[PDB]
Amino acid sequence: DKNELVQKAKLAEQAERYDDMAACMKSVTEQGAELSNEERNLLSVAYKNVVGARRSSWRVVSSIEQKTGAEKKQQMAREYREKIETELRDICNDVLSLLEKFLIPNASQAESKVFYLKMKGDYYRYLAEVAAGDDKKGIVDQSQQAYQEAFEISKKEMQPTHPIRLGLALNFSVFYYEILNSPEKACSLAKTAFDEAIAELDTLSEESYKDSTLIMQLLRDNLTLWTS
């Protein structure tokens, strides 16, 4: 039952049991109906936390592996980093399968398409963070194609203050900065998004203005950090 699963996922989020919350929202998704705004947010928050734990762990262990010299300890950090990498890839592949099999082909609304295509960009970007060779190139290409399609639809259909459109610009600029090592393009994307939102503050909605003005602050933070 969809209502029960959604309610369970909300409880798991308060308990900070993100595996539980992801399992509920995955079951909702697998029922084949389009998701509401609420269920979309729950699914995205759930998997962001499940993948975020591995991304954080991966950075720490990869940093330990590079700072060790002591060959036996360095081997052990390498093997553990590899284990963490396998979990990360399995989570990303799970999300990306849901996006491919249910969410994107079923998205009847511009807002949902942008949301899911942004999410598709994010999870390929997480894969690109840990990918290696000829593999990395195909992954990086998949992330950019998803972000670029999301970007085009959001510019045609959504007001510049829309939190989804602003959040997409934020993460697309991060992709240019850390995946494509392109800070000037990253700054230009983040600065244009901020300036187009601030030229159209009247399109802020009472339900969403707190999200919007928060993401505008995050865009300018990145702008601030990168250009210094």
Binding site: L170, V174, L218, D221
Partner: peptide, 4 residues
């Protein structure tokens, strides 16, 4: 760098 902050992502969403």
């Amino acid at each position: 760098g902050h992502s969403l």
